[PDB]
Amino acid sequence: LENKFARTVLGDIPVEKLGITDCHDHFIKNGGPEVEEHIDFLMLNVDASIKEFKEFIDRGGSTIVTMDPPNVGRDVLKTLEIANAVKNLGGNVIMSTGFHKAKFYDKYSSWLAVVPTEEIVKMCVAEIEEGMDEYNYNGPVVKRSKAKAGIIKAGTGYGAIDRLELKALEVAARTSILTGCPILVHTQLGTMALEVAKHLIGFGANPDKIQISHLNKNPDKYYYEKVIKETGVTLCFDGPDRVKYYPDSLLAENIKYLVDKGLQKHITLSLDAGRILYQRNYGLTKGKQTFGLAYLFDRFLPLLKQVGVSKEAIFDILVNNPKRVLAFDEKRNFDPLKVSKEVLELKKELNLN
Question: Where does this protein hold Zn(2+) 2?
Fold first, then answer.
């Protein structure tokens, strides 16, 4: 037997326990830069989150990966309350270390800008292998939870990879290489996905460990296919019930295209419900009827069957693919001399060395 594990906030589990997995979601977003953009990004209700998680499990789901990097909204303590409330129902929660896109960090004075890459990797490795900081790397005082992170995030901005984002991708790659952890990268409007994949692989990261999210905001089925085929990474889509970007139908038809091209093993799904009105129970706390996690099962997955995606492809998308991409690799040494020439050259051009 393979005997691979994933790292949840409650401990390492066999990847076979992951079950149906929402690969990019949120429950608690406790302040941070996002809240500056809009009050709706503030999400602080443990009871509402647990109720929403229970509706997810009620429909057949088991695992949620809450992708909040330490400095952008993450709350270890509250998320651990949620995890503990569902564990005996088969619920699992994986949390993240790492960084969001550069726009969320002060480019002059943030620790991302200023602290040498190597010291940052040590802090990310520590969240994966010792415990996440309950103060979320907000400052010089650290108080580690017994809960560990099970994945590392990075993010890129619109139509461009910033020099600090390339630095954060190097952090993600190195941490992943050293700990075996998986990586998920947020792209802005689904831009630069091909390049994000190329650079992470150029640093030495294993493409089987890599998800790139938000491609649904660049609804280009040819590009999706190009990314999967040239790099081997996995695309994590959100998009259901985000009509202000694109209708559900477009994502379903693009997925159907990829499945028809034989690429069903390279697709994961998520709701990325990272605003307060994007969950049903939260919506209720604001006096509103809204959709949340149940909608994946009640509405989106049936639309997928309707446009011609098989139940077997869906089983890969919800179960087999997460079981592959969230599994820890064996630990490796990081060798800076094996970094690809294309990456080294780009670091030089971006004044990163």
Answer: 153, 186, 214
CA separation for the pair 129, 7 (Å, rounded) = 10
Neighbour count for residue 118 (Cβ, 10 Å): 12
For the CA atoms of 335, 341, 344, 348, the dihedral, rounded to the nearest 10 degrees, stands at 160
242 is in an annotated binding site: no
| 276 labelled binding-site residue | yes
Q: Which two tokens stand for residue 301?
A: 């997955």
Residue corresponding to tokens 């292998």 = 129
Tell me if 24 is assigned to a ligand binding site: yes
CATH class name, domain 1-353: alpha beta
Closest CA to 331 of 176, 152, 127: 176
**DSSP code for 278:** G
CA distance 316 to 310: 10
- For the chain, domain boundaries: 1-353
199 is in an annotated binding site: no
**Distance (Å) of CA 207 to CA 129, 198, 210, 324, 341:** 21, 9, 5, 11, 18
Would you say 324 is a known binding-site residue? no
Instruction: Find out whether 303 is annotated in a ligand binding site.
Output: no
Does 184 count as an annotated binding residue? no
Please, what is the angle between helix 163-179 and helix 117-129, to 10°?
40
Query: What is the helix (H) or strand (E) element at residue 71, kind and residue range?
Result: none
Q: State yes or no: 272 annotated in a binding site.
A: yes
Do residues 248 and 304 touch, judged by C-beta distance below 8 A? no
